[model samples]
Target: PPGPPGPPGRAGEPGLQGPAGPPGPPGPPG
Candidate 1:
């Protein structure tokens, strides 16, 4: 018997993973 074909993913689809970015700036003096 033949096996079922795999589902293809959409092209240029939105990624669940996000890229790393710089941290926030330092807080003001008290």
Candidate 2:
């Protein structure tokens, strides 16, 4: 009886702001 190790997967909230670059290069067109 030894089961207590499963809590490590939460870190994704900081990626939303790409539509006003300085020229081009963001997504699409190889």
lDDT of each: 0.86, 0.87
Listed per model in order, the count of residue pairs whose N, CA or C atoms clash below 3 Å is 0, 0
- Give candidate 2's TM-score: 0.26
Pairs with backbone N, CA or C atoms under 3 Å apart (clashes), candidate 2: none
- Model 2 segments more than 4 A misplaced: 18-30
lDDT of 1 by residue, 1-30 (tens): 999999997689676888888888989999
**Model 2, range 1-30, lDDT digits (tens) per residue?**
999999999999999988875876678886
TM-score of each: 0.28, 0.26
